[PDB]
From a paper:
Here we report the cryo-EM structures of the trimeric S proteins from the BA.1, BA.2, BA.3, and BA.4/BA.5 subvariants, with BA.4 and BA.5 sharing the same S protein mutations, each in complex with the surface receptor [name]. The five sublineages of Omicron exhibit numerous mutations in the S protein, which is responsible for receptor recognition and facilitates fusion with host cells. The [name] may exhibit “up” and “down” conformations in reference to the viral surface, and only the “up” [name] can expose the binding site which is responsible for mediating the interaction with the peptidase domain (PD) of [name]. This interaction triggers the conformational changes of the trimeric S protein to further expose the fusion peptide in S2, which then facilitates membrane fusion with host cells.
Structural analysis has identified 17 [name] residues on the interface with [name]. Sequence alignment of the [name] from WT, Delta, and Omicron subvariants reveals that nine residues, Tyr449, Tyr453, Leu455, Phe456, Asn487, Tyr489, Tyr495, Thr500, and G502, remain identical in all the subvariants, while six mutated in BA.1, BA.2, and BA.3 subvariants, including K417N, S477N, Q493R, Q498R, N501Y, and Y505H. These additional contacts, particularly the strong salt bridges mediated by Arg493 and Arg498, may not only compensate for the lost interactions of Lys417, Asn501, and Tyr505 in the WT S protein, respectively, with Asp30, Tyr41, and Arg393 in [name], but result in a two-to-fourfold net increase in affinity. As seven of the eight common mutations shared by BA.1/3 are located on flexible NTD domain, only the G446S located on the [name] was mapped. In addition, G446S, a common mutation in BA.1 and BA.3, might lead to the interaction between Ser446 and Arg60 of the heavy chain in LY-CoV1404.
Author numbering:
A (entry chain A): 19 to 615
B (entry chain E): 338 to 359, 364 to 383, 392 to 516
The structure:
């Protein structure tokens, strides 16, 4: 009866009621997402608002147990994840204004349009048609028009709203003893009071900045290669000692360099491994794919599928009028109900997204015994890492030629694996500088070290200094370039895409080492080995009940994120690049710009 | 026997039907019987109790267990003499929008004594300031309810249990 038995008794009732209402709300949202109408929208919003109201009332009720007296750990973790005041600590007017500017920013980003300069009645949105020019065109002037016009005609509507989104968010976060909004965001990687696995909210910055300093020797070489190859498709526009113009990078922002593969392919006479014909020649339906995926997962030692998963899931595209949302996801409806929603075709990319989504479902199944509030990955970057290693391992010739899609003969050469590794690096390594630099900019903006009359100046300075990408037209202080990205104008954290890329290769190396692999790392397949399955399950089954610095040690052997596994993955490409840039100039100078002449 | 094995409705766990009864071979060649591990055997008269619980709780109806069922709802002694059977009724005891007519208790002041039944409905008192018959802070209503639905994984579905006792 001291202070703790009361907290435990209260958490029991909370768990029961929350489980029930959550199942109802999630079932409504599923029944809307797979079958769109006008009544299902209301049947979903009803349960949604009911669940939100219940959570708000229970949070207001759970403030009467002083956190500084609970001596357990899981009880304290639950009560602390429940006591979070969140928003609504502001006055009413400020809360309403914050909601309104959030909605306005999302609407502006979603339905903004730019049109031709010689026929102004021919506009085109961003998603179907603008970022189709950026990813397909080979004209300098057309890409420049698209890039400039998006930022000049949508980025300039988001600045006066962002300038006060920052103030309102900063004030909300300061009203919770957090010192700014950036600290609130970093407050997810925090561990307090475990005596051996501590982690401060201020050490994440130092660790990110220290592990990024060991990627630069590889990113510089990939940069030099991409530049010396782009200098043959846009001659007399790139300078061999300068940066890369920001509109030649494959998409509207340069987040992934994966669209430059047709331009910078190492050996263009060797076709890539692509099994789509041998799947059609054997009548592989939309259900043999998932059977092979389940077989792969049960091979290592993980359970089967629940048999309620096969009947309720929407694996194929439905009939004539069943309009749905074709975006592959895994659903965790609760009460022991797991489902998959995807509209699969008979291809090879769907053959990998199958393994990805079933990995998500396996993670969801493993920790379903924990209390309600402790059902999640250890932090923001664990779930996608676990999902990604499966797709990484299920796309190798040593696995395809044993499933039955490739001839048992047909050995692979080394040129094909250099092709594969370069296409992997164009989307794995070419996105780490971007992510790190954008998150550094946002942290420095929220903290207060960049006054609001120096946003674009600092943004383009850091772009030239960290990423190696110069703008093609000067941008004064009336623009707002970061807010023209989905995650910036919709208030989503962005550092998870950086720690995930490290956790994923750490997991893959620690799992391939237990399966007794011998060759290079990019050829390993964890299938048919039970020790790897056990080592992965011993961390899957934990959830949020333990600090993430312990869940990471259960599998790998270290406490913080490392970077040596990633470079170990890319070693062969690194040696080839280091021998292909003898004549070029490795690096860049931050003074040249495409308009300086 | 014919009455409580195939009836149209079964009883809830906190208040279970009891029958002091005044042919065994027929029960076997029947419904899946997802568990039939008894103990007493490999009489004057026999009692036959029955109830409806969750799936993953069936492993708690046994001598020397622990849970919110064998501490507050139904407990067997350590020298149990009868046996226990349990099977699935997912198609006959579940409906869309929940089957809220099955209850169980998750709050009590003292653990049950073997072969006891608790029907009381007093407001539980967790704190130290007395409650005086009204819910609120630190005082709860001790009878929740399964939300039985057909789209549940095996383990959250309803299971019918029947215990036979010897003496
Ligand atoms: C998908 O949604 C549509 C409309 O939201 C459903 O169509 C109606 O569903 C109700 C449900 O009982 C029926 O009574 C009506 O007769 C249906 N009308 C038509 C025109 O279809 C549809 O049933 C939903 N899909 C499924 C599989 O239930
Ligand atoms: C309070 O902490 C104790 C240990 O610090 C937890 O005890 C565990 O409880 C689970 C659930 O019954 C058992 O399976 C473990 O064996 C217990 N551990 C030990 C060392 O005995 C307890 O669960 C915590 N409180 C809550 C509500 O979870
Ligand atoms: C969370 O927000 C509340 C206000 O919404 C803060 O203020 C306390 O609220 C409780 C609610 O019962 C009052 O009893 C206290 O008098 C309030 N003031 C205090 C405690 O100084 C509350 O402090 C906030 N807590 C956290 C952890 O953010
Ligand atoms: C792929 O393997 C071939 C097979 O040896 C390599 O070809 C060798 O290239 C070196 C270059 O210094 C020559 O000295 C050898 O004579 C070549 N081998 C033969 C049999 O003639 C090729 O270099 C490898 N390519 C990559 C990208 O690693
Ligand atoms: C996992 O190992 C099993 C058995 O070691 C493999 O299954 C057999 O593999 C041999 C060797 O090719 C075949 O002759 C048998 O016909 C296979 N049996 C079956 C039922 O397929 C299996 O191929 C291995 N899986 C992977 C992905 O390598
Ligand atoms: C269980 O009870 C049901 C009815 O509650 C019995 O079902 C009857 O079975 C006989 C023989 O198979 C049929 O002639 C009747 O028509 C059935 N009744 C109905 C309503 O369908 C069943 O036989 C009982 N089984 C046992 C083992 O006791
Ligand atoms: C998985 O399912 C197959 C048949 O679908 C079965 O033979 C196998 O035993 C199952 N695996 C486990 C661990 O039960």
């Amino acid at each position: 009866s001291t202070i703790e038995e009361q907290a435990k008794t209260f958490l029991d009732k909370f768990n029961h009621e929350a489980e029930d209402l959550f199942y109802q709300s999630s079932l409504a949202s599923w029944n809307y997402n797979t079958n769109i109408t006008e009544e299902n929208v209301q049947n979903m919003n009803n349960a949604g608002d009911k669940w939100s109201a219940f959570l708000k009332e229970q949070s207001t009720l759970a403030q009467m147990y002083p956190l500084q007296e609970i001596q357990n750990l899981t009880v304290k973790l639950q009560l602390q994840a429940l006591q979070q005041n969140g928003s609504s600590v502001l006055s009413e007017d400020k809360s309403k204004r914050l909601n309104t500017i959030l909605n306005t920013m999302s609407t502006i980003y979603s339905t903004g349009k730019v049109c031709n300069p010689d026929n102004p009645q021919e506009c085109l949105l961003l998603e179907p048609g603008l970022n189709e020019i950026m990813a397909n065109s080979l004209d300098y002037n057309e890409r420049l028009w698209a890039w400039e016009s998006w930022r000049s005609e949508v980025g300039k509507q988001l600045r006066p709203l962002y300038e006060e989104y920052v103030v309102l968010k900063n004030e909300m976060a300061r009203a919770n003893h957090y010192e700014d909004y950036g600290d609130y965001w970093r407050g997810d990687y925090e561990v307090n009071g475990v005596d051996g696995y501590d982690y401060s909210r201020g050490q994440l910055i130092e660790d990110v900045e220290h592990t990024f300093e060991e990627i630069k020797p590889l990113y510089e070489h990939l940069h030099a290669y991409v530049r010396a190859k782009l200098m043959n498709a846009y001659p007399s526009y790139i300078s061999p000692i300068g940066c890369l113009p920001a509109h030649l990078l494959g998409d509207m922002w340069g987040r992934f360099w994966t669209n430059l593969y047709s331009l910078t392919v190492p050996f263009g006479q060797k076709p890539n491994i692509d099994v789509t014909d041998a799947m059609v020649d054997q009548a592989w339906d939309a259900q043999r794919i998932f059977k092979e995926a389940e077989k792969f997962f049960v091979s290592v030692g993980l359970p089967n599928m629940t048999q309620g998963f096969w009947e309720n899931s929407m694996l194929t595209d439905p009939g004539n009028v069943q309009k749905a949302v074709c975006h592959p996801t895994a659903w965790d409806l609760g009460k022991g109900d797991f489902r998959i929603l995807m509209c699969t075709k008979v291809t090879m990319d769907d053959f990998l997204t199958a393994h990805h989504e079933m990995g998500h479902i396996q993670y969801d199944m493993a920790y379903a015994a924990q209390p309600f509030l402790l059902r999640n990955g250890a932090n923001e970057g664990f779930h996608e890492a676990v999902g990604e290693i499966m797709s990484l391992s299920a796309a190798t010739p040593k696995h395809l030629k044993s499933i039955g899609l490739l001839s048992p003969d047909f050995q692979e050469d080394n040129e094909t694996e250099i092709n594969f590794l370069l296409k992997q690096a164009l989307t794995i390594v070419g996105t780490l500088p971007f992510t790190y630099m954008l998150e550094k900019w946002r942290w420095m903006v929220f903290k207060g070290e960049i006054p609001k009359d120096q946003w674009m100046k600092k943004w383009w300075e850091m772009k030239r200094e960290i990423v190696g990408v110069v703008e093609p037209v000067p941008h004064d202080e009336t623009y707002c370039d970061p807010a023209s990205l989905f995650h910036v104008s919709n208030d989503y954290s962005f550092i998870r895409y950086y720690t995930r890329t490290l956790y994923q290769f750490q997991f893959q190396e620690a799992l391939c080492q237990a399966a007794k692999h011998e060759g290079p790392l990019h050829k390993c397949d964890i299938s048919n080995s039970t020790e790897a399955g056990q080592k992965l399950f011993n961390m899957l089954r934990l959830g949020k009940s333990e600090p993430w610095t312990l869940a990471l040690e259960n599998v790998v052997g270290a406490k913080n994120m490392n970077v040596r596994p990633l470079l170990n993955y890319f070693e062969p490409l690194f040696t080839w690049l280091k021998d292909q840039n003898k004549n070029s100039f490795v690096g860049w100078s931050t003074d040249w710009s495409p308009y300086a002449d | 026997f014919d009455e409580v094995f195939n009836a149209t409705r079964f009883a809830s766990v906190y208040a279970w039907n009891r029958k002091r009864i005044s042919d065994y071979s027929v029960l076997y060649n029947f419904a899946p019987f997802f568990t039939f591990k008894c103990y007493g055997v490999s009489f004057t008269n026999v009692y036959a109790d029955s109830f409806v619980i969750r799936g993953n709780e069936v492993r708690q109806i046994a001598p020397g267990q622990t849970g919110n069922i064998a501490d507050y709802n139904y407990k067997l002694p350590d020298d149990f003499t009868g046996c226990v059977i349990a099977w699935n009724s997912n198609k006959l005891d579940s409906k869309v929008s929940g089957n809220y007519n099955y209850l169980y208790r998750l709050f009590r002041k003292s653990n049950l004594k073997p072969f006891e039944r608790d029907i009381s409905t007093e407001i539980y008192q967790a704190g130290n300031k007395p409650c005086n018959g009204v819910a609120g802070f630190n005082c709860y209503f001790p009878l929740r309810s399964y939300g039985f639905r057909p789209t549940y994984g095996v383990g959250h579905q309803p299971y019918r249990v029947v215990v036979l006792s010897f003496e």
